Amino acid sequence: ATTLKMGMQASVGSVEYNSAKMLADTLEEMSQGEIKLALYPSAQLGDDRAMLQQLTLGDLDITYAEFGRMGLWIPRAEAVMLPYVAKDFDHLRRMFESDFGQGVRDEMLQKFNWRALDTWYNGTRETTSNRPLNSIEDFKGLKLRVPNAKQNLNYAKLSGASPTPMSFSEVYLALQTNAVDGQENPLPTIKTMKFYEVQKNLAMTHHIVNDQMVIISESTWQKLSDTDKDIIQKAVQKVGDAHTQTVKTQEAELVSFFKSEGINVTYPDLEPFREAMQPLYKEFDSNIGQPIVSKLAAM
Ligand SMILES: CC(=O)N[C@H]1[C@H]([C@H](O)[C@H](O)CO)O[C@](O)(C(=O)O)C[C@@H]1O
């Protein structure tokens, strides 16, 4: 009976945890009990960076990560998380399946012991705040929490806000005590973490589309039978259809839910946000020496 360990920052009640639990149940049923999955939610093992490292080193078997998070180690991958470059999940999937994406996935495998089995949709990030964001000019000086992620910081900085990086587990208390003014996350996350309880405004900035790769350590993969490999691949893809459809459905009806909770929802013009990102797209292309932003944006 193989027990695999899977870690996530998301908490019980999140879509990420619910999909992991559906995956664990699917694995146990398709395997007649031979594959079990122990879940370690709420970032008890660290953040996604720390968990990815645990897959590399061998003490964690599965975890979640965005394709663009690979840029911490594989700098060209960062481009897929630059603000406003990926237009929706299908676009991000084209990047993931392209020759470019295959090359990143091959480097993930051969250098970092990361096998990407699939990538699911985890939502488009939006911006909450303790005062309305009606246009980019409102961002000036906003103390906007961001994760420890350069592109989220750049979104905040180039919009004129003051980025404050801090771990996900600390965000609610930081909003409640008004140590920060706002944060940015997909709508299902805002709902599950109850950030709408401590934020009066939500701005549809659509600034970064998050996918969610399901990654298994290659050292664990090569110790599984090829039958178990096939069960896991099939289970991940089936659960991934449910996860992606659930996120899509929830992102839609959550605007109605937040309004019913008294949240002020704004729809700022996004063209000024894209224009504000131009010095970032040029820095990135010039630093890497090739027009990566340009062709990713056209894929
Ligand atoms: C797989 C994973 O851990 N995703 C986490 C992401 C990424 O760390 C970030 O987008 C950089 O890729 O940050 C969050 O949205 C956040 O802290 O607000 C929590 C989310 O659970």
Q: 113, 219 in Cβ contact below 8 A? A: yes
CA-nearest residue for atom 17, ligand 1, is 168
What are the Cα distances from residue 26, in Å, to 23, 35, 216, 247?
A: 5, 10, 17, 20
CATH (domain of 135)? 3.40.190.170
Indicate the number of domains in the chain: 1
Tell me how far the alpha carbon of residue 153 lies from the centroid of ligand 1, in angstroms.
13
Q: 87, 206 in Cβ contact below 8 A? A: no
Q: 201, 263 in Cβ contact below 8 A? A: yes
Range of the domain at 201: 2-298
Q: Is 208 in the pocket of ligand 1 (CB under 6 A)?
A: no
Atom of ligand 1 nearest to the CA of 186: 15
Tell me how far the alpha carbon of residue 234 lies from the centroid of ligand 1, in angstroms.
25
Resolution in A: 1.7
Q: Is 19 in the pocket of ligand 1 (CB under 6 A)?
A: no
Q: Is 10 in the pocket of ligand 1 (CB under 6 A)?
A: yes
